[PDB]
């Protein structure tokens, strides 16, 4: 159960939920990077604030 | 389990609820700062009171 979970987050996360949470945060980081690049490219194409 | 939560609000919060509440208040403060910055930038762009 509470083996890989750090001592601070023991009452919240299980052993499986910690791994799922790690996957989720990595996905969110990748999505944020891709979104930043997409927004920069769209501003280069056509600025939406004039 | 009632640990690390002050006795004043013990009849309301657990320790997990205490951690969730801390996360919520930190999120609120960050959002408030970003909102203030956004309003300043929008005012510099186009004032709405003249």
């Amino acid at each position: 159960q509470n083996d890989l979970v750090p001592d601070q987050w023991k009452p919240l996360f299980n052993n499986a939920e910690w791994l799922v949470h790690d996957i989720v945060v990595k996905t969110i980081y990748g999505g944020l990077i891709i979104a930043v690049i997409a927004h920069v490219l769209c501003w280069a194409w056509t600025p939406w604030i004039r | 389990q009632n640990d690390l939560v002050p006795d004043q609000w013990k009849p309301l919060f657990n320790n997990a609820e205490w951690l969730v509440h801390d996360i919520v208040v930190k999120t609120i403060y960050g959002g408030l700062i970003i909102a203030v910055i956004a309003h300043v930038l929008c005012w510099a762009w186009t004032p709405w009171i003249r």
């Binding site: - | 004043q8 609000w9 009849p11 309301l12 709405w48 009171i49």
Partner: protein
């Protein structure tokens, strides 16, 4: 009261109420701060809710030729319809109402070098059709809108009615007004009025005829911008206690007359002055109970008005 639970409940209730009212307050403050006020309707001295201006479709050479012709001809030289008017008045009418109800240039129908010329230039058919449309307007508001009472206002039918600033390409039945109807339904102008769309209590009629009635009735109240209760007391639809129903009977007769006489005279399209385009209630009333292109009383050549 003594426990934390009751104090929390009271504080939560007051916080929720104040947050709701403050949210509504700030929403409406922002809304009224940034949202512009609506524009007031037109104050044109001729039209109800229509303007000829800006007159950018009329070139400078056209105005120069108009002024030269007025200077060289105090009186009209060849007029068959517009009688009792000087060249100045005719030109004012042809600027404000003709060519301002179609939004075209003086060279659309005329020859700039000589305004009295009849043929010899490739735009004589336009002038012929324009004269026929003057005669039609005279007839229309001479024996159809002169039957309405004075409580409606006494507005006249002019060129900007039925045109709304376009010369050709007029759409009596746009796709925007076919929202709940089949996109091929047309007004049943081959019937007689009153009596063409009466269904109540009839045993030689069924739901097919009631549907055909309802299509026309929804067309009517989309063309007026109103509900069914503008012309009816909904507790008895046969009743004639609202004056708009009699006004509508007169206007159904007028539009049937337009179909029979000017769209397909004698049953053949080739003899009409319109390109086989049957009228509707929407063509004049563009979502209002008084057409925007209608002329105010006293603003139409007297020969083309209801007074003669």
């Amino acid at each position: 009261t003594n426990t934390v639970r009751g104090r929390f409940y009271i504080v939560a209730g007051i916080i929720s109420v104040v947050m709701a009212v403050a949210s509504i307050a700030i929403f409406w403050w922002i809304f009224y701060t940034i949202t512009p006020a609506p524009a007031p309707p037109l104050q044109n001295p001729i039209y109800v809710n229509y303007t000829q201006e800006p007159t950018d479709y009329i070139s400078a050479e056209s105005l120069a030729a108009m002024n030269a012709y007025i200077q060289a001809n105090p009186q009209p030289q060849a007029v068959q319809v517009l009688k009792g008017m000087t060249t100045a008045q005719i030109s004012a009418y042809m600027v404000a109402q003709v060519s301002g109800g179609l939004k075209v240039d003086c060279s659309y129908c005329h020859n700039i070098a000589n305004f009295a010329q009849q043929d010899g230039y490739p735009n004589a058919a336009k002038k012929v059709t324009a004269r026929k449309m003057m005669l039609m307007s005279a007839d229309l508001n001479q024996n159809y809108t002169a039957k309405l009472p004075a409580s409606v206002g006494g507005y006249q039918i002019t060129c900007a009615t039925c045109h709304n600033g376009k010369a050709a390409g007029l759409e009596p039945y746009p796709i925007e007004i076919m929202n709940t109807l089949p996109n091929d339904w047309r007004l049943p102008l081959e019937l007689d009025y009153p009596g063409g769309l009466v269904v109540t209590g009839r045993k030689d009629v069924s739901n097919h005829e009631v549907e055909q009635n309802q299509f026309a009735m929804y067309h009517m109240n989309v063309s007026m911008g109103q509900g069914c209760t503008f012309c009816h007391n909904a507790r008895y639809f046969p009743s004639y206690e609202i004056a708009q129903k009699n006004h509508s009977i007169i206007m159904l007769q007028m539009t049937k007359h337009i179909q029979e006489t000017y769209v397909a005279p004698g049953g053949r399209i080739a003899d009409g002055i319109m390109a086989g385009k049957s009228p509707s209630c929407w063509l004049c009333h563009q979502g209002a109970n008084i057409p925007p292109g209608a002329a105010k009383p006293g603003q139409v050549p007297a020969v083309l008005s209801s007074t003669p």
